Amino acid sequence: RKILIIEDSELQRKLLSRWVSKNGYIAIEAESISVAREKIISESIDVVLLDWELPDGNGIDLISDILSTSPVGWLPIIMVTGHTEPEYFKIAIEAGATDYITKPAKEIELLARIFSALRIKALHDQLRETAIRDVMTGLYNRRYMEERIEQEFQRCKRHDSLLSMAMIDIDKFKNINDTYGHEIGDQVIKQLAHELKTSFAKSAIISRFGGEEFVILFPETGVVDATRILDRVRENVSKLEMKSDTDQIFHFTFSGGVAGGDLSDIQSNQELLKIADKNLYEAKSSGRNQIIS
Amino acid sequence: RKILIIEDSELQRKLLSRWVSKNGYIAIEAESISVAREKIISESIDVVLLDWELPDGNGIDLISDILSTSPVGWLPIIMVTGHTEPEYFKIAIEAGATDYITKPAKEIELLARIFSALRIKALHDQLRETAIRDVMTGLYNRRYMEERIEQEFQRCKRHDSLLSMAMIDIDKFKNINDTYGHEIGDQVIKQLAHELKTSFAKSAIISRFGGEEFVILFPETGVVDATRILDRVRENVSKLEMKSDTDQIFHFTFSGGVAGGDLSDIQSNQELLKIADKNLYEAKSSGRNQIIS
Ligand SMILES: Nc1nc2c(ncn2[C@@H]2O[C@H](COP(=O)(O)OP(=O)(O)OP(=O)(O)O)C[C@H]2O)c(=O)[nH]1
Ligand SMILES: Nc1nc2c(ncn2[C@@H]2O[C@H](COP(=O)(O)OP(=O)(O)OP(=O)(O)O)C[C@H]2O)c(=O)[nH]1
Ligand SMILES: [Mg+2]
Ligand SMILES: [Mg+2]
Ligand SMILES: [Mg+2]
Ligand SMILES: [Mg+2]
Ligand SMILES: [Mg+2]
C-alpha cells in the first residue's frame, strides 16, 4: 500500500509519484538520503524506488540501513537509476536490492514490477507471521520473543529510553483442566490472549512464552505506568464469566511480575527476565490475582 | 540449486544453460511445452526460465501448472522472451511470473535476477522450516502434519500406491513426570524422537502431534510391514535403560495404532486419522506396550 520514492530530480520524482498514486498506492516522496532516513523511521513502507546518485550520497549505501530498520526484516527495493552498466546492476542486487530499472522508467513496466514486488512481500509477511507467532493464540512464540527482548533491550540502553517487562501466569490452571477438561483450558488461554492483544498500546510486544505463561515488553514505559495498565487487565479478566461444556459458570485470574523501567543498573536482558520471574513467584505466594513490581 | 529452462532455440537454450550451470546450478533443459510438462512432474525445480513462443503452445499457459507443483504453491518464474509489448509484460506478471528479461538476455543481468529470486526463496524456505518444525524434537508439528497427510493422501490415491499411518502415545507418561520431574519427561520425549528419526526409512514423514503423541506416514508401505517396523521400535524403546536425576534406572513403553495400506475403500484423509486413533485406544485398553492394526 505505501511506496517510498527516493529521487533528487523534481520532475522525475513528481512523475513516478503521480503514476504510483494513480493505481491506488500511497506515494511518499524523498528528495534526498537525509529525508529518506526520516520517512523510513516515521512510516511503515511496503516498497522502495531508489535512485543511485542523490546530492547527499549513493543509494547502494542506504540499502543496508533500510533492511536493518525494517520491522519485518525484508522489504522489496527497486533501483531506478541512469546507470545502465551491468556491473552496477550486479552490485545493487548483491547489496540487497530486489529489482533494477534503467531510466527512463516506463509506466506499464514500473507498475508491473511493483505488483511483482508487493506479491512477494505479501507472501514473505505471511510466512514470517506463521514462523514467529504461536499457532493457538496468534501471539509471538518463545524462540522469537527471546531474540526480540535481546534486540529491544540493547536498543533502549543505546538510548535514554525506558523498557518495562511483565511476566504473567494463569492462577490455578491445572485445577481448571482437571475440573472442566483440556479443551476448556485451551479456550481460557485463547480468551486471555485476545484480551492482551487488544488492551495495550500498539508498541507493546506480547508473547505466549509457555503453555500458560505470557511476557509483555512495554517500550518507552515506566515500571509504575506498566503496572497500573496490567492491573486494569487483571481486574477485567477476574470479572469475565466463562462457561464449561456442562453450562458451569466460573472465573479465572492471573498473577503478574513486572520489571525494568530505568535500565541503568540492569546489565544483561536475562537479569530483566529473573527480576520479573522473582516478582511473579512473589505474587503467587502473596495470594495470587495481583501484580507486583 | 535446480533450474528448468524452456526455450525452442538450441543456440539460446544451450547458452542460457551453460551460464546457469557455470555458477554451480544444475540445468534442466526443455525444447518444448510437451517436454516441460514431463520435467515439472518428474523433478522438483527451484527456478524456471520461460520462453513465451514455443512450437507447441505458449509459456503463459504453463505458468499456472508450474505454481501448483510447488508444495506451498509459489515458485520464481522468469520470462525470457522476444516479446517487448507492455501488454505481454503486464499479463505475464499477472499470470504469476516473478520477473521478465527481453532478449537478447545479458549474462550479468540473467544471473543477478536468478540470484534475487533464489535469495528470496532461501529466506522463505527457512521461515517455512521454523513454522513447521517442533523446537524440542525437530520433527513436524501438528498444523503442518494435518496439511501433509491431506497432500500425501490425495497424491497416493492419484497413483495405485500404498500409504500406512501410525499413531503412538507414551504409556503412563503422567506417572513419569510425577516420579522424576518435568525435565526427565522432556528427555523421555526427546529419546523417543531420536528413536523415530533413526529407525525408519528416508521416505517416512514423522510428526510430534501432541505433547507426548506422534504420527508417522509410511509412503509405499503395507499395513503389515508398517506394523512389524513400529513393533521393532516399540521393543527397542522398552529395553532402553533411562536414568532419573538420582541415578534410578527405569523403562518406558508406547502403544501404537496403525492404519491405511490399500486406499481403495478410504474416502477422506480424516478417515485415516480415526482408524489409527481407534486402534491406539484399542492398544491402550488391551494392556499397553503393543501395536494394533
Ligand atoms: N489446556 C492447556 N493446559 C496447559 C497447556 N500448557 C500447560 N497446561 C497446564 O497448565 C499447568 C500450568 O502449571 P503451573 O505453572 O504449575 O500453574 P498452576 O498449576 O496452574 O498453579 P499456579 O499457576 O497458580 O501456580 C501445566 C499444565 O498442566 C495448554 O497449552 N493447554
Ligand atoms: N514433560 C512433559 N510432559 C508433558 C508435555 N506435554 C504433555 N505432557 C504431559 O503428558 C501427559 C500425558 O497424558 P495422557 O496423554 O493421558 O497419557 P498418560 O497419562 O501418559 O497415560 P496413557 O497414555 O497410558 O493413558 C499430559 C501432560 O501431563 C511436555 O511437553 N513435557
Ligand atoms: Mg539523481
Ligand atoms: Mg499457572
Ligand atoms: Mg506455569
Ligand atoms: Mg499417554
Ligand atoms: Mg496423549
Author numbering:
A (entry chain B), B (entry chain A): 6 to 298
Paper excerpt:
C-di-GMP is a near-ubiquitous bacterial second messenger responsible for the coordination of a variety of cellular processes and behaviour, including motility, biofilm formation, virulence and cell cycle progression. DGCs catalyse the condensation of two molecules of GTP to yield the twofold symmetric c-di-GMP product. DgcR from Leptospira biflexa is a constitutively dimeric prototype of this class of diguanylate cyclases. Here, we show by biophysical and crystallographic analyses that DgcR is a constitutive dimer that changes coiled-coil geometry and domain arrangement upon pseudo-phosphorylation.
